[PDB]
Amino acid sequence: KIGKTLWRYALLYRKLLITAVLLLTVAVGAELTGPFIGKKMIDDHILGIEKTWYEAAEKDKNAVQFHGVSYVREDRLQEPVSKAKEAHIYQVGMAFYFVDQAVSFDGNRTVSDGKLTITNGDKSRAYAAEKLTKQELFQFYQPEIKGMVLLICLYGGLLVFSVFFQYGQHYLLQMSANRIIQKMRQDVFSHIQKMPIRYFDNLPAGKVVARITNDTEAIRDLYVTVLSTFVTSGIYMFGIFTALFLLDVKLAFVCLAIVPIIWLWSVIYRRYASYYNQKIRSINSDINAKMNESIQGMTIIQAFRHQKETMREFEELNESHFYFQNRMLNLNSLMSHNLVNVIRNLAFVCLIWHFGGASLNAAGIVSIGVLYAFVDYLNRLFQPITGIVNQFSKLELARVSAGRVFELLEEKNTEEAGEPAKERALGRVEFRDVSFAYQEGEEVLKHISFTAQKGETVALVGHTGSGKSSILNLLFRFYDAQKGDVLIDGKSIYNMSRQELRSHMGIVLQDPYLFSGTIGSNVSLDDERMTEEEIKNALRQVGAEPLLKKLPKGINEPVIEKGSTLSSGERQLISFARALAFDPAILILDEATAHIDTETEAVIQKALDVVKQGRTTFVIAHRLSTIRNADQILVLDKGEIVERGNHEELMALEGQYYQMYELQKGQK
Template sequence: MKGGGDNGIVRPVIEQDEIKNRIFDRRLYGRLLHYLKPYIAGVIGSFLIVMVVSLAELVQPLIQRRAIDDYIVSDKNIAVFQDETTANSFLNKYSYLNLKRLTYEGRYFVILNSADLNKINQQDILEFKNKGIIGEEKVFLIVDKPENIQILNKYLPEDQHPKGGKEGFKGWFRVGDGQIAISREQLNKVPKSERFQLRNEAANKLIWLALAFLIISIIRFIAGYFQVIITTIFSQKAMNDLRHDAFAHLQKMPVKFFDVNPVGRLVTRVTNDIRAIDEMLSSGVITIIQDIIMIIAIVVLMLLLNWKLALVSFAILPGVVWVIVIFRKRTRPVYREVRKHLAAVNATLNEHISGQKIIKLFNQYKRKREEFARINQEYYNASMKQMKLFAFFRPIIHVSSQIAVALLIWYGGGQILRNAITIGLLMAFTQYISKLFQPIDDFSEKFNVLQGALAGAERIFDLMELDPEDYREHLKTGIRLQGAIEFKNVWLAYNPDEWVLKDVSFKIEPGEKIALVGHTGSGKTSIVNLILGMYPYQKGNILLDGKPLESYAVEDIRKNVGIVQQDVFIFSGNIRDNIALNNKQLSKEQIIQVAKYVNADKFISKLPLGYDEPVMERGATLSTGQRQLIAFARVLAYDPAIFILDEATSNIDTETELLIQDALQKIMHNRTSIVIAHRLSTIQNSDRIIVLHKGVIVEEGSHFELLEKKGLYYDLYRLQYT
């Protein structure tokens, strides 16, 4: 299986989680959107709900404004025209205001609110005030009902000839359309209890406005609830897909990749980094969209309500935008560094917890504690740098919002004193300013989530962009091999110019039993790895049943090769699952038969739950011999054409080794077998022994033939038995 670039040499790729000085590009966003595409209905639904919530947010201050200006504090002036001509002239001149003329007993009335007065030529207003047409005082409008007339007559005279201007109104007067006008000054002369009765109509309107405000609040609550539920559902599904794809991609990576990348860093990518993306999708992206919509809508609405007041309120925004830009630039490398150091912490934890026994045996806990303390301190420093940025940004935004409110009070208050705007409008602007700065104020936290997620996405997709091992699935046939193996001038290097195998050639016939012998590092296990397709080789050819290794699907090769290694990996679960490895075709009886065949049933049957006995991760509750017997049963359960024993009996006691030797004779019958062993007693009955030294075959023959040559094999044998 010759490799691709670098002459087949696989290089380390993410071992240090290096920080990249590039901006998150569109491709990154595109890949994230790819995982949301199947759940686009949920995304659209969430977006529509966000629109409903945003609309509710915008309407509520307008309801407050109307309640204050129309029913609590009047902002209305009244123009009294004594003749129709003057009234019509005024209405025609300002026809764009759509003012309504009211008539009562030969007099003509036009009701003007503060917004209308701001749009009328100030020279005309001054002229009308001097002529007594427009009154200086604000008036309330009361329903013309007998009970109201009775109260008014009790305390105030009816003003038969009302005039405004400097004289003011003397009492109350009818303006037509079933309404009575009365100034605030005159209304205050009526006792409180009866004054409320006069304004009963306004009180009823306030109830309806309050009810509308309450209904909108309930709608906001319900919409917000469903928005969170829908967003969480599609984000969790999208991240479930991403997590599955990331794990599946890891499963397809070549073995060399795992040799040079710590497990903790890989775990961080599939867990913490994806969790950060999930947090962004479930609580960041949609709310950011909502915030953007709200900011644009509020700015537009404020300009429409009163552009001068709006511009005063926005005076602080350029500085806020500048702070956001600076914050955004400085946080990118910080968030990447936090992720980098978190991965280092996880990698160190994984390594130290896995090697805890060795750490204790060699009294290394103090040094390892110091090592972890250093890595943990680096993570702490990076996190504190992140927090300092956060702590600097948020107070600035909060103070900016308060400055905007102060400007609004200063300018808006002066406008109220000039009767240019109303109290209700000022209060609405105050509400809108708070709503405008609230998303900006929360931006630091949301940006925290966003940057963390994008940093995580960058690392995840960098991992997924690495070329996986070519499993050649298009060549899959499910073939059963005969077991012939041939190496032709094979060269292998794990690192450039560091040859592990040098021009190795040999042939194994189907059913032949071969042993590989040599000092540690001579290349025995490397030969096995090449047969399994675990590593790419650089030169030569490997044939299985006379066909190149590359002409088989990797899955077909590995189904035909069973291997028992010295370090047996036992999965969490029970004994049966570790033998069957999720092979549904194996019945319980077949599993027991296989276990008996390799003498594993003797210890399994003594366990409290037998084959259902739970085992801990890596088989911590089992002895080395028991784990290796389970491994023998696991291999035989799949009935491979080629059997490989990689120094699997080197750590087994004599009694267990006798049981295994008995099983090996049965296992190797009519099956191509390759045995790697330092203990030469396990290979004396091999058909042929291949002796390797520094990656080169130096001797080949049977046990007795090699002893007669008195070469390297003879020296190894003499060292063990003399």
């Protein structure tokens, strides 16, 4: 699965996630209580005048004074006597009318005289009403200015606290994501270092590099999305529903019903956008590949007058991709944005319908404060829907990348090792009896038998595939022979740590593997244990080029060209120097500068001689002239050592080596 491993990696670094969740919850609570401040500020202060007023003497503060008498509300009122002398400030049209006595229900109110009759279902009574001046109405509004101020200040304080906590919870979510991905990358790279070379051979470098880095960035994006778009929104939708239910239970069921709308819309949009985005991506990749192969290969396209057919295919791809772009545009418009706005308008219609039904029932109105809070909570709710559906549709690529990474991490086959060597072996290596097949059946080594004594320069000669690079692979335990035995000194290769084995022996393959950095970075591979490389390198005949290449002292940093900064001969020189630095007992030489169409033989033979001394050099040089001074010439007849002996001994028999040497020398 994918969720299981993602959750397992998320449980690591749980303190950060829990802190982020809690800070998000606190900030959410502050933000959502804001609109409750708004509702209270509307109802209790702006709409407080409508509440009943009771007449009282000039004894209590906040008791508003009208004409010669002073009244005070039913809330900012101590209780000397409730009695029955009640006065109201009714509203009809845009006018506020003062009623000095009113004990009855409230309904539709009209004024043609001082009657201020209330109709409701049927007319009940008419009360002598008086119009209130603008200043008098304010006097009836003044007592609530201080509550206004306090609610505003509370609203600002909660705002700043929410600011701080939002910043904190976002920073912690991102820190958690980046720490998890760093852990994943470290683990994947370690596994790569503990992977068999067989896996490396089949897959190209690009695929494994992608698995290490690009897929883990996809995981990063997934964690960011799930954290900062689904958990946050879930906690932002739970709090909103809590507030709405605290406001009005009956209406909130409308939003409980809205949730299925979100579910169905996301499902449909995913179903269609997956198809359209897949086709768009597949055709855009085809367009880019066609463009690349047309630029790369333009000459013959023009020479053979194929400019009227390649353009036709390119236009087919372009038209298809454009058509799918149009279809995606149609779906995107319809499903996303016109729908968000339509649902918002439907919510407004539902608000009006519900509150109107309430207000038509004997003028029993649910506070307009509830309406404002609902309008402020529903505007909040609809903001993140489009992003939610987009991410829900887009999760599939991250899912695939996660699958690839977690299949790499779960590969059972591995190489367990990591123990260096203890003492130098002086260079004894033998192949008493071995047989190697890469996969099955096809044998590249058949009953190979040789014993390379302390005598060095044991050479393998062949061409077009006989099992020499197979011998090299067997020597370093890159591939296991699955049959026979191999020994260095008296020990068996298959009875010791890989690091110990490879600690005895060096290697310089055909292409000198140059690493970005300084020259000293190459000679020591950034070992940091060996101190003096130049001085030792001074004995390796590298005293000319480094002086030419500026003033390296191991600080040149020239390899930024990936190797092109130097010459091929210089690259082989540095490879030989690195091999000499570690001073391995054995030195397995592949085709080193003897690759193709080359004449500068002495230029590298001079270093080859310097590295020859005091080792057991296994050389697979194809140029038999350079190997004539070898001691144990080995000829591979497609998996068999048909002949054995020095160059003179092989020449006398004239089986295959004499003929090959004659051809190679005479042709020159």
